[PDB]
Amino acid sequence: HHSSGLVPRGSHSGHMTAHTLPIPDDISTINLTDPRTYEVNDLSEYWRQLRTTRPLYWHPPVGDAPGFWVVSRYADVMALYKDNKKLTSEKGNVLVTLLAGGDSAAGKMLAVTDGAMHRGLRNVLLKSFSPQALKPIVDQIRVNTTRLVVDAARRGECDFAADVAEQIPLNTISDLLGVPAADREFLLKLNKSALSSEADQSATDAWLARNEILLYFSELVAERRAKPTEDVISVLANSMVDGKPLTEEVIVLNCYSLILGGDETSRLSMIDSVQTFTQYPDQWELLRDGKVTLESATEEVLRWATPAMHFGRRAVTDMELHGQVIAAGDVVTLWNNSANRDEEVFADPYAFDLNRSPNKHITFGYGPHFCLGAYLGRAEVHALLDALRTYTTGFEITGEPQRIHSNFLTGLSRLPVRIQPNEAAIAAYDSDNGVRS
């Protein structure tokens, strides 16, 4: 097929804002560094061509940027994530930094640090991220998510992104950091301008906002040194690693990295689930009516959404893969989106199947840098699915969804929907007789 429908033909809604996308088959015509590529193409045939004929692919130089390896198979993606000896994240872990020749947070922030410092940081954070420790946070995810979904169902017409998804990950992360309730709005506005969101003034506002967030975290550090708590900021502030306390910069940058890593990806996954349910209403029905577990459904939403399309590395030494040499210094990119559609691992990979088993998707990565927040990411999706299945009977697209613009992340920033409330469920929620969520 030359083209594909953006909106599946079986969709229950969204048909009035459907558009077709080309399905490119000529590898040479695709520039992976261009964010527009991901919005103007259905890359399904492209990734299949790479997996089957060029599993290690040298993407050419674009502009002043170097070429880079593209790794498309699940087995190879998994194998390369595992190796932080011959590969490093210390020159950046995504295209923008990799192609720039580095990341100024290298050696300090988890995602761009390897060796003893990386293990030391992960080690200091282990207790904080245990399911036992995260129980109060998970409890509050349920309460918060239920409240948002109920309120949205009550109103009918909303933007699922702004009215539900936006208002969950930063609260989760704020709980985790120990950010006071009073500062969460304050923090929310900074985070929004710190990511893009466009021009000169937008780029200027982004770096200013990031700088203000680090300053604020620096203030909380100073408080937690004077008066320790059990939150992540305190843990980082009061820890030592290999005989030394962490520098102010290291603590603040890793606090921030929880927002960087957890906020947008969690939102994108949740937003994706709603669009996907309108596209595959049979799957929605299975979820709503209790015919698949939340656990199984959560994993398939994660595999389907794969919001972080790629992560990358740089070769420390020469390595061989597929009868080819990756040279010391070469950029290497690992495509999770392709891995999560690899038919060699996932039967019928373009089938959205809530009861999919097995489902060892690679949405959270693998190896030493495996997503620090994976348990929380899953809990947010799990809580959303539970809220949707309990308090709504269904929902429809009521306007055109808007894509984010990235060569790294993929998904929606806006999703206009009308939600059909489960009236009986909401009545019991509202009832004055002692049961909420």
Binding residues for heme b are: 93, 118, 122, 313, 369, 371
Residue 158 CA to residue 148 CA, distance in Å, equals 11
The pairing of beta strand 331-335 with beta strand 68-71: parallel
Instruction: Confirm if 388 and 121 have CB atoms less than 8 A apart.
Output: no
- Residue of the chain from 50, 99, 110, 315 that contacts ligand HEM (CB under 6 A): 110
CB atoms within 10 A of CB 206: 17
The count of residues interacting with ligand HEM (CB under 6 A) is 26
> Which DSSP helix (H) or strand (E) runs through 395?
strand 392-397
* Amino acid sitting at position 105: A
In terms of CB distance, is 114 or 205 closer to ligand HEM?
Answer: 114
CB atoms within 10 A of CB 426: 18
- Residue of the chain from 376, 384, 404, 412 that contacts ligand HEM (CB under 6 A): 376
Residue 190 CA to residue 170 CA, distance in Å, equals 11
Can you read off the two tokens belonging to residue 267? Answer: 């939102």
In terms of CB distance, is 56 or 137 closer to ligand HEM?
Answer: 137
Closest contact distance (angstroms) between CB of 121 and ligand HEM is 7
Closest contact distance (angstroms) between CB of 25 and ligand HEM is 28
- Residue of the chain from 365, 394, 411, 416 that contacts ligand HEM (CB under 6 A): 365
* Residue 269 within binding range of ligand HEM, rule CB under 6 A: yes
* Residue 266 within binding range of ligand HEM, rule CB under 6 A: yes
* Amino acid sitting at position 46: Y
Give the residue at shortest CB distance from ligand HEM: 373
In terms of CB distance, is 345 or 372 closer to ligand HEM?
Answer: 372
Instruction: Confirm if 272 and 412 have CB atoms less than 8 A apart.
Output: yes
Binding site per annotation, positions: 93, 118, 122, 313, 369, 371
Residue 211 CA to residue 205 CA, distance in Å, equals 10
> Which DSSP helix (H) or strand (E) runs through 276?
helix 248-279
Q: Backbone phi, then psi, for 326, in 5-degree steps?
A: -90, 120
Closest contact distance (angstroms) between CB of 112 and ligand HEM is 8
* Residue 80 within binding range of ligand HEM, rule CB under 6 A: no
- Residue of the chain from 15, 54, 122, 405 that contacts ligand HEM (CB under 6 A): 122
* Residue 364 within binding range of ligand HEM, rule CB under 6 A: yes
In terms of CB distance, is 277 or 429 closer to ligand HEM?
Answer: 277
Closest contact distance (angstroms) between CB of 160 and ligand HEM is 16
* Residue 340 within binding range of ligand HEM, rule CB under 6 A: no
In terms of CB distance, is 129 or 206 closer to ligand HEM?
Answer: 129
- The separation between CA 263 and the C-alpha centre of its own chain, rounded to angstroms, equals 8
| Residue list 243-262, contact with ligand HEM (CB under 6 A) | 257-258, 261-262
Closest contact distance (angstroms) between CB of 434 and ligand HEM is 32
In terms of CB distance, is 58 or 370 closer to ligand HEM?
Answer: 370
Closest contact distance (angstroms) between CB of 151 and ligand HEM is 23
Instruction: Confirm if 310 and 333 have CB atoms less than 8 A apart.
Output: yes
Residue 156 CA to residue 231 CA, distance in Å, equals 37
DSSP state of 60: P
Peptide bond into 35 cis (omega under 30): no
- Beta strand spans in 160-277 (E): 240-241, 244-245
Instruction: Confirm if 299 and 356 have CB atoms less than 8 A apart.
Output: yes
- Residue of the chain from 234, 265, 340, 422 that contacts ligand HEM (CB under 6 A): 265
CB atoms within 10 A of CB 109: 24
The single residue listed with the structure tokens 């613009």 is 405
Closest contact distance (angstroms) between CB of 351 and ligand HEM is 21
Residue 6 in 3-state DSSP? coil
- Residue of the chain from 160, 217, 277, 311 that contacts ligand HEM (CB under 6 A): 311
In terms of CB distance, is 315 or 376 closer to ligand HEM?
Answer: 376
Closest contact distance (angstroms) between CB of 332 and ligand HEM is 11
| Residue list 168-187, contact with ligand HEM (CB under 6 A) | 173, 176
| Contacts with ligand HEM, residue ranges (CB under 6 A) | 89, 93, 110-111, 122, 173, 176, 257-258, 261-262, 265-266, 269, 307-308, 311, 363-365, 369, 371-373, 376-377
